[PDB]
Amino acid sequence: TNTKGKRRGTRYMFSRPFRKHGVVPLATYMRIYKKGDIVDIKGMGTVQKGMPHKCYHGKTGRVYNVTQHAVGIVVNKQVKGKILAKRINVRIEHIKHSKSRDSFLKRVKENDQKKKEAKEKGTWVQLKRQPAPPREAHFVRTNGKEPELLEPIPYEFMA
Amino acid sequence: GRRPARCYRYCKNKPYPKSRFCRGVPDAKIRIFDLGRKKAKVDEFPLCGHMVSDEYEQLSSEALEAARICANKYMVKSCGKDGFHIRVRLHPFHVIRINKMLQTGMRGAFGKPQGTVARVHIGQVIMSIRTKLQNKEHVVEALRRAKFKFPGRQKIHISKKWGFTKFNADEFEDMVAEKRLIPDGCGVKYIPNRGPLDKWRALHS
């Protein structure tokens, strides 16, 4: 059997990237985390305090509590056949703001900005994003040149 | 003494080199990987022939020495004592194990290091010989004789390259002439158009 150690198998996971060791850049610490904000967990190995467990690395959660140097996050964690909503405490170094929700915020701002105008102009805009449609019927111009003829190559033993 | 090579023909295990975790490994039977005129220049031995593997198999160090003795003997007989250069292009790094049983059974059945065996892929060169152009049938018969020391199927392929180099034999001589390859012992050194200009002045003085 294995060991139940806390950092078992985290040799590359908690390690720093190549030529990215040493001083933590200080705008990591300057980012505002509100209640309810959606963030991504990624354990930095420079700071050994507040370190999330390896099952939270690469998980995304919702911040429920904010303290001086750390936040509490609600994280979905699958425990065999049930998913638990975790209440974990993790420092500011091991988290980063998720960008998955701030494109939905861009979509709702351009969707309420397309509801509130064009209503006075009477036309109808689209808000539900359709998937990638079949390609429309189009003409392909071969102006002058004939399409180049391809043949399979003879087999030559390379080396 | 040692088992027949059919026990360790296939690359079944993960690679297992000798390191600080594998100790008590006996030295390989093959030690010398180059025979013939090692000191021959790059323009003296233009014609290169390879013995190329066709299987993902494992060649023993004993076989790698037997084939180089067979090929060496035919090339010293046919091309004369120094008219060739043989490079064995596999070095046996994968250690094979043995669980010797004279009783414990399969309890604690992790082997002690039995021997050293090289791993070859489909299309990887096993042996290479460079020589003069007129010794081509002697190269082909030398590798064809050395074939029988090896398990599995090997092809003999006269390479497009110039000896033991990465450059083609047709483009080789005029790109030596244009001072793109400077001959440096066995092979060549490529001179790109990218260094400081003092190297270009030293080359074009």
Binding site: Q78, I83, R87 | -
Partner: protein
């Protein structure tokens, strides 16, 4: 008499028979684990929201 040591073989089927349900998120989630100083001040704010009730109706 040796035996099988460990497996996770039929487990993914058993987890999916009644489903792998996401945990039940409802609005107004509980305040367990929030900062006690912040929560004590929040309870003072909730205790005195009735104070400025006339300004609200005005």
């Amino acid at each position: 008499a040796k035996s099988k040591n460990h497996t996770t073989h039929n487990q993914s089927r058993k987890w999916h028979r009644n489903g792998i349900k996401k945990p039940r998120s409802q609005r107004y989630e509980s305040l367990k684990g929030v900062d006690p100083k912040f929560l004590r001040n929040m309870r003072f704010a909730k205790k005195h929201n009735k104070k400025g009730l006339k300004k609200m109706q005005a």
